[PDB]
């Protein structure tokens, strides 16, 4: 509403920035990665990457450079941030104390200035005397690197040429002296310039070289002894010194473009260069000591890459943007087999995300994300999950396992060395031998009979509890003992054992069993009003394994009574839920607490408290895992215990905080389990599907899985088709001209690689041409099943999946527009309707229109759309045609479109919003309010029925609302802007996911440029007043890295106007909160107001906002920790 | 065009001998409240950068702009959505560069040359004793937009922004377009799309429009800058009153070269408003007579202020009267009024040449107030 809280869920992948140094040590070699508002560091090891620092900052990471002034032990880094903050720092370490300390900071934003079009460059002379700043077109900024300059003074020397494409100070000269790349009306040239230290003013440089290639883009500053520099352009390479010139335009570098390079060795022999598409180059100066020739040698394909940086053992780190970031080796076979690279580690990037969408919106078992992520080469699906992982040791191909339990069979040794298996009518028995799993006879146990229960048992000897009978096994002798059989040898109906009792029903009947040396005894025998669905005698509390209570099911009447042991008297009757039967009864004990576990076969679970003195109910709550009935097994976690439920949905039940957690498990379906802990095996344990064993150990941290499906194009829209287990994607290629009268692909990708395939038409220079398809691809294999190519300079834009009017069909629907180079405006374009059946993508209508098919929207039974400058709805008939209804011509194009009951929020890219309301009985639409407000707008969303919020020019928020305290219509059309925010990142999809990560109310989610994800949701005016006080004295506390202040930081900000936030509460600010001090907490709480429920607000404590806090950061994905 | 230097319209010579010229400086701060001055008899809605020629004779009136000449200059022109009522909630300011006054015979005439120079809000009109009235203003911002890549554009992308000059060929405009949105796959938007929000493509759209209906713009007649070029065009565009209130509204050059661009595709012909059966012209018969353009603002002897577009051809008109060349707005052509033949509305005046030498011999002055834009 007007009261906005906006969290971090996934911090942003991709990646700006990487420079190499020594800032932790001078002797430790150091990788800094820059993520936009992050900074990671490394540490450079003949493995990998150590990760030993991450930071964050109030801003946009523009410039990251390290250097080393004189008189100092390390590196300095200089960070610029994309709000003109800078600053000096430095890395302290006090034994494990880590602190990044600001040496110098200040604000260096000029007051009137035309930001350049190359953007913000930032250099420092290679002897520390200066850094200088290209920030506005005329004006170099120096900021002299003295001691006494802790405010980073700095002052501007006006440059004549006004359109710099890019500088850097040279080496190996008298006077610090810059080196540029210039455009005017004459062409492209390059220049330099010393700069007097005593006038603050430029003197004429050293060499300049006029009508450079058209396309130089790149300046690289050469080291001693060479110096000079040299120009990348889009042909050729060139050197420049002051009587020397060399130029190169190999054929290799022809085909795309050079936009980053890297210095491999101090001496500048070679260059690392990677162009837009992935190829890796060497440039090679090579000397005659003078400089006579440049050589450029292709090493390979690496993702595309914003930024590389050459680490050490022919190790590079390449970072990116549009793809996932690599860690890669330069092979040692140069002189046989030429020079070549070879991946060794991928990190994850999600960035750009470019659509999104939500599976498994309800909360019983968490959604996931799926993702368009990446572009070109690099463009992916990414399915995103938060669960707990295990990770998989062993795989065994056993179908119709029933059971799983471990055994010792030697008493001597600790670790379990036996897994028993019960399969219908038959156990078999596994014996684990370090990694080796060989099937094995125990002599003692029936090998025809289906065990309920198998297990080591106290004086040394092994139980099988089995339908036919009860056995008692000798270790040692390695023989039976014992058998109980039922007095009309019956069979067992339910089973439940422990080290020292055993307790059995057969029908109704229930029989204690106690186990003696060599012997077993029928303690007690007893009926009940209804048959036994489950068993339960663990022994909680202080015993010699023994269990005063047992926990029993009823099948006629579901309940859950605890009876006295070996009373066998019941002493409490519980809830009964309704029909479904309890299918698993367990007692555990988690932290000191006393709990009791049902489970029932439509997959509910109750948990009621229970005391081991009285074992009454303390509380009645039902949490719903799965569908499929639940399995409750104990496993030991570390020193605490925690029970794994099995069904089709995996979970563990934790206790934090004496709270009940119910966590997901990554994997797909789980009938069985037990804990296992063998010498090969340790602390792990066994799972069963339907057909496989798995031997496995839990991660032990919650943590994000991703599923990347790769599809070597790039993918734009995404929609999930529940009902034919499928997503919808859009997804385009490029091909280049053939010389045959045609194009041809550049590679094999998702829309050339289909199991089916289909086209529009069947119709028949190096120019490229995007070529359109919608894929469909399997929602659990992630194979593409099928894809649909469409006509030819057709632009595929906008996507539905739906039902529509009284049609039971769920249709995928794609819009269109016909893109000619000639015409701006599209004039024809085409609403295409396709269902997916028997592994075919039919065409079941179309519809043509007069202009492009921006955007779509499944309105009451009927497709909204918005062609050009207009929004239309249209009918779905009888005859499977889209017949219009109405249409409502707007000023604006309606390239946003958002709807919420009969409401439909229309938006435009310079950020006009126009809100519209659908009259039935008129059967026309209703402009209800505007608001048209200069600035461009990259997504929009509707939070309710008043409030509406958008992303808008320099990565902000805002949220706009119909105001309710109006009488003029004048008053009611317009908007009131509610809430502005800088967030940070460039928003390119809003959705909503409910609960999907399960104070707060309702749940948008967005994904970004960076690969970051956030979450926006509503605050009472109560709570925003009380988190919008602990923000201010928060701020007071937590030390901001270049001490930028988290005010300004969050100021919405255009290159015009920079505004106070307002609306917004940062929950990535408050969460901070849990790491301060606690007499820092204090402090923070002081003076502020804890409004609860009752409306007299008390003081707060520390304690409150603890838990206010806590529970906060459970409404979205926990961060990962990055260090060790 | 022969014989006729297309300076003159612009110079307003019929206004009288040489006039003190006054260099102004005066810009109020973005968002601002001022009091400005109002002209009671001025009702037309004045465009930024356009001139506006005045005659004033009421004591009350020359006395305010004689005080006016000193001090900023300025006064507000109030563009009326009710001219009975005289409501306006939009206006733009107003700065005199050339002033005369004549006492001559006892007579007490000012003459002024003024430019549009701010749009502003009208947060209240009072009327004072003199009869003038002043008004209560809030300075409307030109709102300057950043390129739509900037936020979204790679560093590594950043070199490749500056582009080679263009030699406007077809193909240099497929590639700016590539290498100027080449960052729009970030986006969820194509790279054409982004074009069309695009200043400088969209003023060459208007300037490619613009040179097939008049071939004679052969030199580049429009400003370079985008807003300067907005208004240029916006002043020129023979539009209805309220239209025209609306691209004043707009404070954002992309949004007016749009809306322009829109309506040069939308509108054929040229109609009388009052009967509204009558074409008097077509846009291919409009031609620039002026520097300034088609249409510009003249004033009468009383007083009155016309927009007057020159047509090479009329239809559908009435003459009557004698041809005069007194007080031509054109040097070098006689007037004669002009009626629609159904209504006998005066849309405006038939220019004939007092010399045979003199090209066009013949060409139409027509009032935008008496012509209604028509979508065929
Ligand atoms: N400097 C300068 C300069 C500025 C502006 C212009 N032209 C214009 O605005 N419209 C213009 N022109 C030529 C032919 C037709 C024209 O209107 C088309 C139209 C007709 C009726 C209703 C609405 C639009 C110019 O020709 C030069
Ligand atoms: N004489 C007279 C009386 C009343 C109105 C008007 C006139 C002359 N005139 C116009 C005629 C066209 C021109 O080129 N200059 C003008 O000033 C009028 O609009
Ligand atoms: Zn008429």
Same mark, same amino acid.
């Given at each position: 509403?007007?009261?906005?809280?906006?969290?971090?869920?996934?911090? +942003?992948?991709?990646?700006?920035?990487?420079?190499?140094?020594?800032?932790?040590?001078? #002797?430790?070699?150091?990788?800094?990665?820059?993520?936009? !508002?992050?900074?990671?560091?490394?540490?450079?090891?003949?493995?990998?990457?150590?990760?030993?620092?991450?930071?964050?900052?109030?801003?946009?990471?523009?410039?990251?450079?390290?250097?080393?002034?004189?008189?100092?032990?390390?590196?300095?880094?200089?960070?610029?941030?994309?709000?003109?903050?800078?600053?000096?720092?430095?890395?302290?370490?006090?034994? #494990?104390?880590?602190?990044?300390?600001?040496?110098?900071?200040? %604000?260096?934003?000029?007051?009137?200035?035309?930001?350049?079009?190359?953007?913000?460059? $930032?250099?420092?002379?290679?002897?520390?005397?200066?850094?200088?700043?290209?920030?506005?077109?005329?004006?170099?900024?120096?900021?002299?690197?003295?001691?006494?300059?802790?405010?980073?003074?700095?002052?501007?020397?006006?440059?004549?040429?006004?359109?710099?494409?890019?500088?850097?100070?040279?080496?190996?000269?008298?006077?610090?002296?810059?080196?540029?790349?210039?455009?005017?009306?004459?062409?492209?040239?390059?220049?330099?310039?010393?700069?007097?230290?005593?006038?603050?003013?430029?003197?004429?440089?050293?060499?300049?070289?006029?009508?450079?290639?058209? #396309?130089?883009?790149?300046?690289?500053?050469?080291?001693?002894?060479?110096?000079?520099?040299?120009?990348?352009?889009?042909?050729?390479?060139?050197?420049?010194?002051?009587?020397?010139?060399?130029?190169?335009?190999?054929?290799?570098?022809?085909?795309?473009?050079?936009?980053?390079?890297?210095?491999?060795?101090?001496?500048?022999?070679?260059?690392?260069?990677?162009?837009?598409? $992935?190829?890796?180059?060497?440039?090679?100066?090579?000397?005659?000591?003078?400089?006579?020739?440049?050589?450029?040698?292709?090493?390979?394909?690496?993702?595309?890459?914003?930024?590389?940086?050459?680490?050490?053992?022919?190790?590079?780190?390449?970072?990116?943007?549009?793809?996932?970031?690599?860690?890669?080796?330069?092979?040692?076979?140069?002189?046989?087999?030429?020079?070549? @690279?070879?991946?060794?580690? !991928?990190?994850?990037?999600?960035?750009?995300?470019?659509?999104?969408?939500?599976?498994?919106?309800?909360?019983?078992?968490?959604?996931?994300?799926?993702?368009?992520?990446?572009?070109?080469?690099?463009?992916?699906?990414?399915?995103?999950?938060? $669960?707990?992982?295990?990770?998989?040791?062993?795989?065994?191909?056993?179908?119709?396992?029933?059971?799983?339990?471990?055994?010792?069979?030697?008493?001597?040794?600790?670790?379990?060395?036996?897994?028993?298996?019960?399969?219908?009518?038959?156990?078999?028995?596994?014996?684990?031998?370090?990694?080796?799993?060989?099937?094995?006879?125990?002599?003692?146990?029936?090998?025809?009979?289906?065990?309920?229960?198998?297990?080591?048992?106290?004086?040394?000897?092994?139980?099988?509890?089995?339908?036919?009978?009860?056995?008692?096994?000798?270790?040692?002798?390695?023989?039976?003992?014992?058998?109980?059989?039922?007095?009309?040898?019956?069979?067992?109906?339910?089973?439940?054992?422990?080290?020292?009792?055993?307790?059995?029903?057969?029908?109704?009947?229930?029989?204690?069993?106690?186990?003696?040396?060599?012997?077993?005894?029928?303690?007690?025998?007893?009926?009940?009003?209804?048959?036994?669905?489950?068993?339960?005698?663990?022994?909680?509390?202080?015993?010699?394994?023994?269990?005063?209570?047992?926990?029993?099911?009823?099948?006629?009447?579901?309940?859950?009574?605890?009876?006295?042991?070996?009373?066998?008297?019941?002493?409490?009757?519980?809830?009964?839920?309704?029909?479904?039967? +309890?299918?698993?009864?367990?007692?555990?004990?988690?932290?000191?607490?006393?709990?009791?576990?049902?489970?029932?076969?439509?997959?509910?679970?109750?948990?009621?408290?229970?005391?081991?003195?009285?074992?009454?109910?303390?509380?009645?709550?039902?949490?719903?895992?799965?569908?499929?009935?639940?399995?409750?097994?104990?496993?030991?976690?570390?020193?605490?215990?925690?029970?794994?439920?099995?069904?089709?949905?995996?979970?563990?039940?934790?206790?934090?905080?004496?709270?009940?957690?119910?966590? %997901?498990?990554?994997?797909?379906?789980?009938?069985?389990?037990?804990?296992?802990?063998?010498?090969?095996?340790?602390?792990?344990?066994?799972?069963?599907?339907?057909?496989?064993?798995?031997?496995?150990?839990?991660?032990?941290?919650?943590?994000?899985?991703?599923?990347?499906?790769?599809?070597?194009?790039?993918?734009?829209?995404?929609?999930?088709?529940?009902?034919?287990?499928?997503?919808?994607?859009?997804?385009?290629?490029?091909?280049?001209?053939?010389?045959?009268?045609?194009?041809?692909?550049?590679?094999?990708?998702?829309?050339?690689?289909?199991?089916?395939?289909?086209?529009?038409?069947?119709?028949?220079?190096?120019?490229?041409?995007?070529?359109?398809?919608?894929?469909?691809?399997?929602?659990?294999?992630?194979?593409?099943?099928?894809?649909?190519?469409?006509?030819?300079?057709?632009?595929?834009?906008?996507?539905?999946?739906?039902?529509?009017?009284?049609?039971?069909?769920?249709?995928?629907?794609?819009?269109?527009?016909?893109?000619? +180079?000639?015409?701006?405006?599209?004039?024809?374009?085409?609403?295409?309707?396709?269902?997916?059946?028997?592994?075919?993508?039919?065409?079941?209508?179309?519809?043509?229109?007069?202009?492009?098919?921006?955007?779509?929207?499944?309105? %009451?039974?009927?497709?909204?759309?918005?062609?050009?400058?207009?929004?239309?709805?249209?009918?779905?008939?009888?005859?499977?045609?889209?017949?219009?209804?109405?249409?409502?011509?707007?000023?604006?194009?309606?390239?946003?479109?958002?709807?919420?009951?009969?409401?439909?929020?229309?938006?435009?890219?310079?950020?006009?919003?126009?809100?519209?309301?659908?009259?039935?009985?008129?059967?026309?639409?209703?402009?209800?309010?505007?608001?048209?407000?200069?600035?461009?707008?990259?997504?929009?969303?509707?939070?309710?029925?008043?409030?509406?919020?958008?992303?808008?020019?320099?990565?902000?928020?805002? @949220?706009?609302?119909?105001?309710?305290?109006?009488?003029?219509?004048?008053?009611?059309?317009?908007?009131?802007?509610?809430?502005?925010?800088?967030?940070? #990142?460039?928003? %390119?999809?809003?959705?909503?996911?409910?609960?999907?990560?399960?104070?707060?109310?309702?749940?948008?989610?967005?994904?970004?440029?960076?690969?970051?994800?956030?979450? @926006?949701?509503?605050?009472?005016?109560?709570?925003?007043?009380?988190?919008?006080?602990?923000?201010?004295?928060?701020?007071?506390?937590?030390?901001?890295?270049?001490?930028?202040?988290?005010?300004?930081?969050?100021?919405?900000?255009?290159?015009?106007?920079?505004?106070?936030?307002?609306?917004?509460?940062?929950?990535?600010?408050?969460?901070?909160?849990?790491?301060?001090?606690?007499?820092?907490?204090?402090?923070?709480?002081?003076?502020?107001?804890?409004?609860?429920?009752?409306?007299?607000?008390?003081?707060?404590?520390?304690?409150?906002?603890?838990?206010?806090?806590?529970?906060?950061?459970?409404?979205?994905?926990?961060?990962?920790?990055?260090?060790? | 065009?022969?014989?006729?230097?297309?300076?003159?319209?612009?110079?307003?010579?019929?206004?009288?001998?040489?006039?003190?010229?006054?260099?102004?400086?005066?810009?109020?701060?973005?968002?601002?409240?001022?009091?400005?001055?109002?002209?009671?008899?001025?009702?037309?809605?004045?465009?930024?950068?356009?001139?506006?020629?005045?005659?004033?004779?009421?004591?009350?009136?020359?006395?305010?702009?004689?005080?006016?000449?000193?001090?900023?200059?300025?006064?507000?022109?109030?563009?009326?959505?009710?001219?009975?009522?005289?409501?306006?909630?939009?206006?733009?300011?107003?700065?005199?560069?050339?002033?005369?006054?004549?006492?001559?015979?006892?007579?007490?005439?000012?003459?002024?040359?003024?430019?549009?120079?701010?749009?502003?809000?009208?947060?209240?009109?009072?009327?004072?004793?003199?009869?003038?009235?002043?008004?209560?203003?809030?300075?409307?911002?030109?709102?300057?937009?950043?390129?739509?890549?900037?936020?979204?554009?790679?560093?590594?992308?950043?070199?490749?922004?500056?582009?080679?000059?263009?030699?406007?060929?077809?193909?240099?405009?497929?590639?700016?377009?590539?290498?100027?949105?080449?960052?729009?796959?970030?986006?969820?938007?194509?790279?054409?799309?982004?074009?069309?929000?695009?200043?400088?493509?969209?003023?060459?759209?208007?300037?490619?429009?613009?040179?097939?209906?008049?071939?004679?713009?052969?030199?580049?007649?429009?400003?370079?800058?985008?807003?300067?070029?907005?208004?240029?065009?916006?002043?020129?565009?023979?539009?209805?009153?309220?239209?025209?209130?609306?691209?004043?509204?707009?404070?954002?050059?992309?949004?007016?070269?749009?809306?322009?661009?829109?309506?040069?595709?939308?509108?054929?012909?040229?109609?009388?408003?009052?009967?509204?059966?009558?074409?008097?012209?077509?846009?291919?018969?409009?031609?620039?007579?002026?520097?300034?353009?088609?249409?510009?603002?003249?004033?009468?002897?009383?007083?009155?202020?016309?927009?007057?577009?020159?047509?090479?051809?009329?239809?559908?008109?009435?003459?009557?009267?004698?041809?005069?060349?007194?007080?031509?707005?054109?040097?070098?052509?006689?007037?004669?009024?002009?009626?629609?033949?159904?209504?006998?509305?005066?849309?405006?005046?038939?220019?004939?040449?007092?010399?045979?030498?003199?090209?066009?011999?013949?060409?139409?002055?027509?009032?935008?107030?008496?012509?209604?834009?028509?979508?065929?």
């Amino acid at each position: 509403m007007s009261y906005n809280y906006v969290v971090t869920a996934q911090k +942003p992948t991709a990646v700006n920035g990487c420079v190499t140094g020594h800032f932790t040590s001078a #002797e430790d070699l150091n990788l800094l990665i820059a993520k936009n !508002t992050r900074l990671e560091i490394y540490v450079v090891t003949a493995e990998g990457l150590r990760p030993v620092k991450e930071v964050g900052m109030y801003g946009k990471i523009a410039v990251m450079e390290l250097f080393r002034p004189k008189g100092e032990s390390k590196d300095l880094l200089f960070i610029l941030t994309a709000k003109y903050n800078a600053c000096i720092l430095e890395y302290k370490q006090s034994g #494990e104390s880590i602190d990044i300390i600001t040496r110098a900071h200040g %604000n260096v934003q000029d007051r009137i200035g035309r930001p350049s079009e190359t953007g913000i460059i $930032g250099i420092i002379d290679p002897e520390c005397r200066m850094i200088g700043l290209r920030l506005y077109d005329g004006l170099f900024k120096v900021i002299p690197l003295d001691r006494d300059n802790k405010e980073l003074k700095a002052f501007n020397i006006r440059l004549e040429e006004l359109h710099v494409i890019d500088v850097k100070f040279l080496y190996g000269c008298q006077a610090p002296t810059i080196c540029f790349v210039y455009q005017d009306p004459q062409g492209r040239h390059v220049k330099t310039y010393e700069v007097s230290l005593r006038e603050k003013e430029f003197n004429k440089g050293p060499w300049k070289q006029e009508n450079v290639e058209a #396309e130089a883009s790149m300046v690289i500053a050469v080291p001693e002894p060479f110096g000079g520099a040299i120009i990348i352009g889009q042909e050729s390479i060139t050197y420049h010194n002051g009587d020397k010139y060399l130029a190169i335009a190999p054929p290799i570098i022809k085909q795309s473009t050079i936009v980053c390079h890297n210095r491999v060795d101090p001496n500048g022999s070679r260059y690392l260069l990677g162009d837009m598409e $992935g190829r890796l180059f060497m440039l090679l100066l090579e000397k005659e000591v003078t400089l006579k020739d440049l050589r450029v040698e292709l090493l390979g394909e690496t993702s595309i890459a914003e930024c590389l940086t050459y680490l050490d053992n022919g190790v590079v780190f390449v970072g990116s943007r549009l793809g996932d970031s690599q860690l890669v080796k330069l092979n040692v076979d140069s002189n046989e087999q030429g020079s070549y @690279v070879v991946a060794m580690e !991928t990190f994850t990037n999600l960035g750009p995300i470019v659509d999104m969408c939500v599976v498994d919106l309800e909360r019983q078992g968490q959604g996931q994300l799926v993702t368009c992520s990446g572009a070109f080469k690099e463009g992916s699906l990414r399915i995103i999950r938060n $669960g707990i992982g295990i990770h998989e040791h062993a795989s065994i191909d056993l179908p119709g396992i029933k059971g799983l339990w471990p055994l010792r069979s030697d008493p001597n040794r600790e670790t379990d060395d036996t897994l028993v298996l019960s399969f219908v009518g038959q156990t078999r028995v596994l014996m684990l031998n370090g990694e080796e799993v060989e099937e094995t006879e125990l002599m003692g146990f029936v090998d025809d009979q289906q065990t309920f229960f198998c297990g080591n048992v106290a004086h040394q000897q092994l139980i099988q509890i089995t339908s036919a009978s009860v056995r008692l096994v000798s270790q040692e002798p390695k023989a039976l003992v014992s058998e109980w059989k039922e007095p009309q040898a019956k069979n067992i109906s339910v089973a439940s054992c422990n080290s020292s009792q055993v307790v059995v029903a057969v029908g109704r009947a229930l029989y204690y069993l106690q186990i003696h040396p060599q012997e077993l005894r029928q303690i007690s025998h007893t009926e009940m009003e209804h048959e036994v669905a489950c068993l339960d005698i663990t022994p909680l509390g202080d015993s010699n394994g023994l269990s005063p209570l047992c926990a029993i099911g009823l099948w006629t009447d579901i309940s859950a009574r605890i009876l006295k042991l070996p009373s066998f008297e019941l002493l409490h009757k519980e809830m009964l839920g309704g029909e479904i039967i +309890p299918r698993s009864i367990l007692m555990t004990t988690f932290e000191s607490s006393h709990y009791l576990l049902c489970a029932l076969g439509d997959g509910a679970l109750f948990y009621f408290g229970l005391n081991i003195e009285t074992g009454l109910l303390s509380d009645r709550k039902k949490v719903t895992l799965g569908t499929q009935p639940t399995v409750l097994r104990t496993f030991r976690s570390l020193s605490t215990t925690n029970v794994f439920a099995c069904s089709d949905r995996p979970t563990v039940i934790y206790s934090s905080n004496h709270k009940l957690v119910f966590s %997901n498990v990554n994997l797909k379906e789980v009938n069985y389990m037990c804990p296992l802990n063998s010498d090969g095996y340790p602390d792990s344990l066994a799972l069963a599907n339907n057909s496989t064993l798995t031997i496995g150990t839990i991660d032990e941290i919650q943590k994000l899985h991703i599923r990347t499906v790769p599809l070597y194009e790039s993918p734009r829209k995404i929609c999930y088709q529940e009902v034919s287990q499928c997503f919808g994607v859009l997804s385009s290629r490029i091909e280049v001209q053939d010389t045959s009268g045609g194009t041809t692909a550049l590679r094999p990708s998702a829309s050339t690689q289909a199991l089916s395939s289909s086209v529009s038409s069947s119709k028949l220079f190096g120019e490229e041409v995007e070529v359109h398809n919608l894929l469909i691809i399997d929602q659990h294999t992630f194979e593409v099943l099928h894809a649909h190519q469409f006509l030819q300079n057709e632009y595929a834009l906008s996507l539905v999946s739906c039902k529509l009017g009284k049609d039971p069909n769920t249709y995928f629907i794609v819009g269109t527009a016909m893109v000619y +180079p000639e015409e701006a405006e599209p004039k024809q374009g085409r609403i295409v309707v396709f269902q997916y059946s028997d592994g075919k993508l039919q065409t079941v209508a179309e519809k043509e229109v007069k202009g492009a098919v921006y955007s779509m929207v499944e309105f %009451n039974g009927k497709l909204l759309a918005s062609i050009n400058s207009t929004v239309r709805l249209y009918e779905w008939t009888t005859e499977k045609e889209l017949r219009t209804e109405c249409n409502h011509y707007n000023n604006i194009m309606a390239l946003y479109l958002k709807t919420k009951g009969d409401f439909i929020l229309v938006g435009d890219l310079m950020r006009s919003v126009l809100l519209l309301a659908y009259k039935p009985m008129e059967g026309n639409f209703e402009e209800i309010a505007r608001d048209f407000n200069p600035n461009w707008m990259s997504a929009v969303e509707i939070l309710d029925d008043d409030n509406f919020l958008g992303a808008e020019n320099a990565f902000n928020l805002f @949220v706009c609302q119909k105001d309710s305290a109006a009488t003029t219509d004048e008053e009611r059309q317009h908007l009131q802007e509610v809430g502005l925010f800088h967030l940070g #990142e460039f928003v %390119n999809v809003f959705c909503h996911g409910s609960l999907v990560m399960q104070p707060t109310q309702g749940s948008v989610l967005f994904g970004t440029v960076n690969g970051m994800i956030g979450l @926006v949701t509503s605050l009472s005016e109560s709570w925003y007043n009380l988190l919008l006080d602990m923000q201010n004295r928060l701020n007071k506390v937590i030390k901001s890295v270049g001490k930028i202040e988290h005010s300004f930081w969050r100021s919405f900000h255009t290159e015009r106007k920079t505004e106070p936030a307002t609306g917004f509460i940062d929950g990535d600010l408050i969460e901070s909160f849990l790491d301060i001090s606690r007499p820092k907490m204090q402090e923070v709480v002081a003076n502020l107001q804890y409004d609860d429920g009752s409306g007299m607000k008390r003081e707060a404590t520390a304690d409150d906002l603890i838990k206010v806090v806590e529970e906060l950061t459970r409404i979205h994905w926990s961060h990962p920790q990055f260090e060790k | 065009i022969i014989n006729f230097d297309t300076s003159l319209p612009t110079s307003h010579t019929y206004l009288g001998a040489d006039m003190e010229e006054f260099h102004g400086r005066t810009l109020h701060d973005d968002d601002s409240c001022q009091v400005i001055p109002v002209l009671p008899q001025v009702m037309m809605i004045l465009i930024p950068g356009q001139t506006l020629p005045l005659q004033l004779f009421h004591p009350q009136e020359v006395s305010m702009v004689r005080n006016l000449i000193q001090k900023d200059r300025t006064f507000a022109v109030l563009a009326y959505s009710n001219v009975q009522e005289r409501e306006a909630q939009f206006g733009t300011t107003a700065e005199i560069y050339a002033y005369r006054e004549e006492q001559d015979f006892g007579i007490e005439i000012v003459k002024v040359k003024a430019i549009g120079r701010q749009r502003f809000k009208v947060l209240e009109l009072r009327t004072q004793s003199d009869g003038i009235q002043q008004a209560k203003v809030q300075i409307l911002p030109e709102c300057v937009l950043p390129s739509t890549m900037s936020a979204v554009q790679l560093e590594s992308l950043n070199k490749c922004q500056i582009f080679p000059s263009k030699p406007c060929s077809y193909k240099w405009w497929q590639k700016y377009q590539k290498r100027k949105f080449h960052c729009a796959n970030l986006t969820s938007w194509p790279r054409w799309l982004y074009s069309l929000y695009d200043a400088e493509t969209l003023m060459d759209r208007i300037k490619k429009q613009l040179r097939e209906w008049d071939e004679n713009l052969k030199d580049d007649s429009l400003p370079s800058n985008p807003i300067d070029f907005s208004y240029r065009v916006a002043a020129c565009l023979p539009i209805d009153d309220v239209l025209r209130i609306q691209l004043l509204k707009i404070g954002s050059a992309i949004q007016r070269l749009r809306c322009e661009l829109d309506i040069m595709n939308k509108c054929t012909s040229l109609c009388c408003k009052q009967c509204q059966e009558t074409e008097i012209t077509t846009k291919n018969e409009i031609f620039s007579l002026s520097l300034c353009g088609p249409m510009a603002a003249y004033v009468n002897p009383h007083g009155y202020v016309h927009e007057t577009l020159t047509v090479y051809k009329a239809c559908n008109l009435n003459l009557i009267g004698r041809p005069s060349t007194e007080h031509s707005w054109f040097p070098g052509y006689a007037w004669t009024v002009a009626q629609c033949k159904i209504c006998a509305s005066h849309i405006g005046w038939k220019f004939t040449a007092t010399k045979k030498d003199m090209s066009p011999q013949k060409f139409w002055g027509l009032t935008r107030s008496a012509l209604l834009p028509t979508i065929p």
